[PDB]
């Protein structure tokens, strides 16, 4: 009986786990003394691992490669040779006839590891010759990286997860650490315990708010209004950091102008917050010796989101909360390895190490190394534009790996036609998802406990994860599949193991070089940059200690005028749908939903958080099936009246296959990072009298999808 160390595949907290293996099976999971979690885990880390064993509760695991030779249907099993030559043939064919950019590839922020995201970008650029490589950063914190890239020169958490415990104030903004990153929540609570203050800015009364000294329930979509007003106060009352501002910032004056206007009072109605709170909050934040900003999707998933990120970073600039421990700007990245995939270059504009393709010197390096003459220099397509490129015949095949767009992408009807407008669609997954079911050719890969590599925690902290078991089927690691297709396409590629990839990588990314496998070890947490292999170089805890990484070393101050989200609350739909996530269930719910204990706390269709006071005047009560209509759709869900959602808005998540909230969301791709406005959707809740008939609708509709997906996997 033994224990195999791993990192949790759910959130980016980067919790270290000891998976007890007995015989040839995973038996139990238990917290390990990792750097972030230190012996603790949450329900998911603890219970969410039996999906490796093909429970088939939700979807049967992918066992054989498959091909759908006729669009009319029928996804029949096929051998590796047949699948692998089919892809290699098809891609090569399409590449010749229409150029390398006619192909779009995606990396994966889940169980694969950093090694394979690296391999994926490598194949797109060296084999296909395209920069068309992107990942969910696109739909998550893509805005965060941009805004931050410009403001301060780097898009990662400025400071570490383990630094929170010593801030003097934890400014939580549009982010629920309590349900999203429980171990990050536990670091927040620690700070409070140690006497730090806490401010939560969210319309809803989220768990976090209870321990908050100040809860600032800003009206959905009024972020910049509230922000400029805080900046207004900080300057008005001379609470800002003059020396810091003068010595390390650029653009103060121009920022000063736009906030002068936004007085606390002029904001009252838009923010729905009183001039006083705004004053006391800005006053509070600016007064902390060290104050840290933790933010998330309440910021990014709004088209005016790069501006909000830029705006927040401004406050921190203005207060000198950068360049020092227990402070900074912290966009807590979401998925276990989304941070990683980015580090690997699963972005359509950067090689791993954040060495952009535009730079000629980088291309010379990478091309030489990959033994290629030219690596493309123009930015690739972003996966969020797929439906648009696809429709235009700009893209003709997609190599979708480790993702479930047909359930997670905004405006799912759009992605379906997208899948219908592409010549070839290849899905590389571990489960028969809605996305895999609508594929031309499916290729299965080894799941988390069946392979190894490295993952990057929310705060750029490298960590190693180990193989615990063997796949019960003839599966390849994601990098072995891509390597074989590359080879079949004429470019030789084969890796004996993941470290081999990690070393090639380390030799091309001067900031990851010192993060050797030996160094990361079993419980090591090595946040890049880590340049020297020297064990004295344990990694970088916080950024911008000496300079700001901007072209000229100064942070760049910034704001703009508030602008309301797209749709408009009418008299019929004064209801604001703000999609979020739930605990116990993670994203796709492909892994989580196939886990016995987690499945047992929540199944279809999902819940819609409806406000107490106003629900009583809507004709909807707790546990009742209700309808949600929209320009994009009309979804069915179970209500849950309570005093938590803010009167006027409702809340739904994207983890449900039946009441797929994304069915209703219109993609209001931000003009900058091309990110959907998943946080604001004008909807109309409608009661349902014949509940009993609705209760069988959810069942029948669920059963249909479950058998559907099942026949495709097991036929
Ligand atoms: N249990 C569980 N955990 C997860 C996930 C999951 O699926 N399940 N997903 C993971 C991933 S991929 C990510 S990116 C993270 C995301 O985790 P979070 O960043 O917490 O994201 P959300 O919960 O979507 O939204 C955060 C908050 O923004 C608030 N908000 C809405 N409108 C506004 C507004 O106008 N202003 C402000 N200030 N706030 C607003 C919402 O009410 C919500 O409480 O969670 C990760 N962790
Ligand atoms: N309404 C609404 N929609 C949203 C959001 C929202 O807030 N509201 N949030 C958005 C955000 S921030 C995100 S992160 C997305 C999540 O976006 P998704 O792309 O849905 O992410 P997952 O659901 O984790 O998908 C992971 C896929 O990879 C598979 N997989 C796991 N391990 C491996 C592996 O080793 N190899 C391979 N090949 N496959 C593997 C899983 O089975 C699953 O099919 O949702 C977005 N959509
Ligand atoms: S889901 Fe997150 S907080 Fe929970 S055990 Fe995993 S990494 Fe840690
Ligand atoms: Mo995310």
PDB file of C-alpha atoms in Angstrom, residues 343-486:
ATOM      1  CA  UNK A 343       3.432  29.955 -18.855  1.00  0.00           C
ATOM      2  CA  UNK A 344       3.762  27.311 -21.582  1.00  0.00           C
ATOM      3  CA  UNK A 345       2.635  29.560 -24.396  1.00  0.00           C
ATOM      4  CA  UNK A 346      -0.840  28.264 -24.959  1.00  0.00           C
ATOM      5  CA  UNK A 347      -1.572  31.905 -25.869  1.00  0.00           C
ATOM      6  CA  UNK A 348      -1.774  33.044 -29.501  1.00  0.00           C
ATOM      7  CA  UNK A 349       0.932  35.659 -28.988  1.00  0.00           C
ATOM      8  CA  UNK A 350       3.609  34.215 -26.702  1.00  0.00           C
ATOM      9  CA  UNK A 351       6.021  31.317 -26.572  1.00  0.00           C
ATOM     10  CA  UNK A 352       6.494  29.780 -23.137  1.00  0.00           C
ATOM     11  CA  UNK A 353       8.359  31.991 -20.690  1.00  0.00           C
ATOM     12  CA  UNK A 354       6.266  34.912 -21.904  1.00  0.00           C
ATOM     13  CA  UNK A 355       8.610  35.434 -24.825  1.00  0.00           C
ATOM     14  CA  UNK A 356       6.296  36.902 -27.509  1.00  0.00           C
ATOM     15  CA  UNK A 357       6.399  35.735 -31.156  1.00  0.00           C
ATOM     16  CA  UNK A 358       6.519  39.336 -32.364  1.00  0.00           C
ATOM     17  CA  UNK A 359      10.082  39.615 -31.039  1.00  0.00           C
ATOM     18  CA  UNK A 360      12.539  38.534 -33.784  1.00  0.00           C
ATOM     19  CA  UNK A 361      15.191  37.360 -31.272  1.00  0.00           C
ATOM     20  CA  UNK A 362      12.720  34.939 -29.650  1.00  0.00           C
ATOM     21  CA  UNK A 363      11.687  33.515 -32.991  1.00  0.00           C
ATOM     22  CA  UNK A 364      15.355  33.039 -33.946  1.00  0.00           C
ATOM     23  CA  UNK A 365      15.820  31.143 -30.698  1.00  0.00           C
ATOM     24  CA  UNK A 366      12.753  28.953 -30.910  1.00  0.00           C
ATOM     25  CA  UNK A 367      13.121  28.284 -34.689  1.00  0.00           C
ATOM     26  CA  UNK A 368      16.735  27.227 -34.284  1.00  0.00           C
ATOM     27  CA  UNK A 369      15.855  24.964 -31.383  1.00  0.00           C
ATOM     28  CA  UNK A 370      12.875  23.375 -33.125  1.00  0.00           C
ATOM     29  CA  UNK A 371      15.083  23.019 -36.173  1.00  0.00           C
ATOM     30  CA  UNK A 372      12.676  25.094 -38.213  1.00  0.00           C
ATOM     31  CA  UNK A 373      13.407  27.968 -40.661  1.00  0.00           C
ATOM     32  CA  UNK A 374      10.711  30.426 -39.608  1.00  0.00           C
ATOM     33  CA  UNK A 375       8.230  30.452 -36.782  1.00  0.00           C
ATOM     34  CA  UNK A 376       5.122  32.547 -37.549  1.00  0.00           C
ATOM     35  CA  UNK A 377       5.359  36.143 -36.297  1.00  0.00           C
ATOM     36  CA  UNK A 378       1.774  37.273 -36.468  1.00  0.00           C
ATOM     37  CA  UNK A 379      -0.558  36.585 -33.534  1.00  0.00           C
ATOM     38  CA  UNK A 380      -2.802  33.617 -33.847  1.00  0.00           C
ATOM     39  CA  UNK A 381      -6.545  33.325 -33.578  1.00  0.00           C
ATOM     40  CA  UNK A 382      -8.118  33.380 -30.152  1.00  0.00           C
ATOM     41  CA  UNK A 383     -10.327  30.360 -29.398  1.00  0.00           C
ATOM     42  CA  UNK A 384     -13.206  32.732 -28.476  1.00  0.00           C
ATOM     43  CA  UNK A 385     -13.324  33.878 -32.124  1.00  0.00           C
ATOM     44  CA  UNK A 386     -13.691  30.280 -33.373  1.00  0.00           C
ATOM     45  CA  UNK A 387     -17.365  30.586 -34.326  1.00  0.00           C
ATOM     46  CA  UNK A 388     -16.567  33.771 -36.243  1.00  0.00           C
ATOM     47  CA  UNK A 389     -13.510  32.457 -38.098  1.00  0.00           C
ATOM     48  CA  UNK A 390     -15.271  29.180 -38.710  1.00  0.00           C
ATOM     49  CA  UNK A 391     -18.296  30.888 -40.184  1.00  0.00           C
ATOM     50  CA  UNK A 392     -16.121  33.015 -42.388  1.00  0.00           C
ATOM     51  CA  UNK A 393     -14.145  30.033 -43.633  1.00  0.00           C
ATOM     52  CA  UNK A 394     -11.158  31.656 -42.023  1.00  0.00           C
ATOM     53  CA  UNK A 395     -10.594  28.527 -39.935  1.00  0.00           C
ATOM     54  CA  UNK A 396     -11.383  24.981 -41.156  1.00  0.00           C
ATOM     55  CA  UNK A 397     -10.421  22.544 -38.424  1.00  0.00           C
ATOM     56  CA  UNK A 398      -9.988  22.740 -34.689  1.00  0.00           C
ATOM     57  CA  UNK A 399      -7.815  20.557 -32.533  1.00  0.00           C
ATOM     58  CA  UNK A 400      -9.767  21.071 -29.302  1.00  0.00           C
ATOM     59  CA  UNK A 401      -7.938  19.505 -26.381  1.00  0.00           C
ATOM     60  CA  UNK A 402      -9.036  19.223 -22.757  1.00  0.00           C
ATOM     61  CA  UNK A 403     -12.020  21.548 -23.050  1.00  0.00           C
ATOM     62  CA  UNK A 404     -15.802  21.518 -23.115  1.00  0.00           C
ATOM     63  CA  UNK A 405     -16.841  24.550 -25.191  1.00  0.00           C
ATOM     64  CA  UNK A 406     -20.303  23.130 -26.009  1.00  0.00           C
ATOM     65  CA  UNK A 407     -21.186  23.542 -22.344  1.00  0.00           C
ATOM     66  CA  UNK A 408     -18.830  26.321 -21.161  1.00  0.00           C
ATOM     67  CA  UNK A 409     -18.730  28.768 -24.076  1.00  0.00           C
ATOM     68  CA  UNK A 410     -21.058  31.774 -24.002  1.00  0.00           C
ATOM     69  CA  UNK A 411     -23.954  31.440 -26.434  1.00  0.00           C
ATOM     70  CA  UNK A 412     -23.765  27.622 -26.863  1.00  0.00           C
ATOM     71  CA  UNK A 413     -26.019  27.845 -29.960  1.00  0.00           C
ATOM     72  CA  UNK A 414     -23.187  29.747 -31.644  1.00  0.00           C
ATOM     73  CA  UNK A 415     -20.588  27.104 -30.791  1.00  0.00           C
ATOM     74  CA  UNK A 416     -22.823  24.375 -32.158  1.00  0.00           C
ATOM     75  CA  UNK A 417     -23.068  25.990 -35.625  1.00  0.00           C
ATOM     76  CA  UNK A 418     -19.337  26.636 -35.223  1.00  0.00           C
ATOM     77  CA  UNK A 419     -18.812  22.904 -34.815  1.00  0.00           C
ATOM     78  CA  UNK A 420     -21.096  22.578 -37.859  1.00  0.00           C
ATOM     79  CA  UNK A 421     -19.167  25.099 -39.969  1.00  0.00           C
ATOM     80  CA  UNK A 422     -15.738  23.449 -39.461  1.00  0.00           C
ATOM     81  CA  UNK A 423     -14.493  20.795 -41.905  1.00  0.00           C
ATOM     82  CA  UNK A 424     -12.875  18.752 -39.170  1.00  0.00           C
ATOM     83  CA  UNK A 425     -13.239  18.954 -35.378  1.00  0.00           C
ATOM     84  CA  UNK A 426     -10.876  16.947 -33.151  1.00  0.00           C
ATOM     85  CA  UNK A 427     -11.481  16.605 -29.443  1.00  0.00           C
ATOM     86  CA  UNK A 428      -8.873  15.230 -27.146  1.00  0.00           C
ATOM     87  CA  UNK A 429     -10.471  14.490 -23.841  1.00  0.00           C
ATOM     88  CA  UNK A 430     -10.820  12.014 -21.015  1.00  0.00           C
ATOM     89  CA  UNK A 431     -14.701  12.033 -20.937  1.00  0.00           C
ATOM     90  CA  UNK A 432     -17.588  11.808 -23.393  1.00  0.00           C
ATOM     91  CA  UNK A 433     -18.551  15.466 -22.972  1.00  0.00           C
ATOM     92  CA  UNK A 434     -21.175  17.315 -24.975  1.00  0.00           C
ATOM     93  CA  UNK A 435     -18.178  18.667 -26.932  1.00  0.00           C
ATOM     94  CA  UNK A 436     -16.590  15.268 -27.562  1.00  0.00           C
ATOM     95  CA  UNK A 437     -19.945  13.896 -28.729  1.00  0.00           C
ATOM     96  CA  UNK A 438     -20.157  16.513 -31.462  1.00  0.00           C
ATOM     97  CA  UNK A 439     -16.721  15.618 -32.786  1.00  0.00           C
ATOM     98  CA  UNK A 440     -15.464  14.328 -36.107  1.00  0.00           C
ATOM     99  CA  UNK A 441     -12.612  12.452 -34.525  1.00  0.00           C
ATOM    100  CA  UNK A 442     -12.146  11.722 -30.794  1.00  0.00           C
ATOM    101  CA  UNK A 443      -8.775  10.777 -29.301  1.00  0.00           C
ATOM    102  CA  UNK A 444      -8.628   9.677 -25.625  1.00  0.00           C
ATOM    103  CA  UNK A 445      -5.822  10.581 -23.231  1.00  0.00           C
ATOM    104  CA  UNK A 446      -4.522   9.674 -19.793  1.00  0.00           C
ATOM    105  CA  UNK A 447      -6.330  11.388 -16.891  1.00  0.00           C
ATOM    106  CA  UNK A 448      -4.751  13.124 -13.891  1.00  0.00           C
ATOM    107  CA  UNK A 449      -3.932  10.163 -11.649  1.00  0.00           C
ATOM    108  CA  UNK A 450      -2.712   8.171 -14.683  1.00  0.00           C
ATOM    109  CA  UNK A 451       0.230  10.424 -15.599  1.00  0.00           C
ATOM    110  CA  UNK A 452       2.538  13.200 -14.249  1.00  0.00           C
ATOM    111  CA  UNK A 453       4.153  16.580 -14.803  1.00  0.00           C
ATOM    112  CA  UNK A 454       4.056  20.113 -13.335  1.00  0.00           C
ATOM    113  CA  UNK A 455       1.136  22.560 -12.673  1.00  0.00           C
ATOM    114  CA  UNK A 456       1.351  26.268 -11.827  1.00  0.00           C
ATOM    115  CA  UNK A 457      -0.634  27.479  -8.766  1.00  0.00           C
ATOM    116  CA  UNK A 458      -2.610  30.761  -8.909  1.00  0.00           C
ATOM    117  CA  UNK A 459       0.458  32.792  -7.807  1.00  0.00           C
ATOM    118  CA  UNK A 460       2.877  31.444 -10.442  1.00  0.00           C
ATOM    119  CA  UNK A 461       4.087  28.682  -8.086  1.00  0.00           C
ATOM    120  CA  UNK A 462       5.455  25.603  -9.905  1.00  0.00           C
ATOM    121  CA  UNK A 463       4.617  22.272  -8.326  1.00  0.00           C
ATOM    122  CA  UNK A 464       5.124  18.655  -9.325  1.00  0.00           C
ATOM    123  CA  UNK A 465       2.435  15.984  -9.601  1.00  0.00           C
ATOM    124  CA  UNK A 466       3.093  12.208  -9.780  1.00  0.00           C
ATOM    125  CA  UNK A 467       1.628   9.177 -11.572  1.00  0.00           C
ATOM    126  CA  UNK A 468      -0.391   7.001  -9.154  1.00  0.00           C
ATOM    127  CA  UNK A 469      -1.908   4.413 -11.387  1.00  0.00           C
ATOM    128  CA  UNK A 470      -2.034   2.865 -14.879  1.00  0.00           C
ATOM    129  CA  UNK A 471      -4.794   3.530 -17.370  1.00  0.00           C
ATOM    130  CA  UNK A 472      -7.108   0.529 -17.772  1.00  0.00           C
ATOM    131  CA  UNK A 473      -7.251   1.226 -21.486  1.00  0.00           C
ATOM    132  CA  UNK A 474      -4.888   1.851 -24.360  1.00  0.00           C
ATOM    133  CA  UNK A 475      -4.595   5.585 -23.844  1.00  0.00           C
ATOM    134  CA  UNK A 476      -1.784   8.033 -24.608  1.00  0.00           C
ATOM    135  CA  UNK A 477      -0.657  11.025 -22.583  1.00  0.00           C
ATOM    136  CA  UNK A 478      -1.801  14.167 -24.387  1.00  0.00           C
ATOM    137  CA  UNK A 479       1.771  14.875 -25.365  1.00  0.00           C
ATOM    138  CA  UNK A 480       2.262  11.373 -26.814  1.00  0.00           C
ATOM    139  CA  UNK A 481      -0.716  11.788 -29.102  1.00  0.00           C
ATOM    140  CA  UNK A 482       0.346  15.220 -30.412  1.00  0.00           C
ATOM    141  CA  UNK A 483       3.920  13.930 -30.746  1.00  0.00           C
ATOM    142  CA  UNK A 484       2.761  11.069 -32.956  1.00  0.00           C
ATOM    143  CA  UNK A 485       0.668  13.301 -35.227  1.00  0.00           C
ATOM    144  CA  UNK A 486       3.590  15.736 -35.529  1.00  0.00           C
TER     145      UNK A 486
END
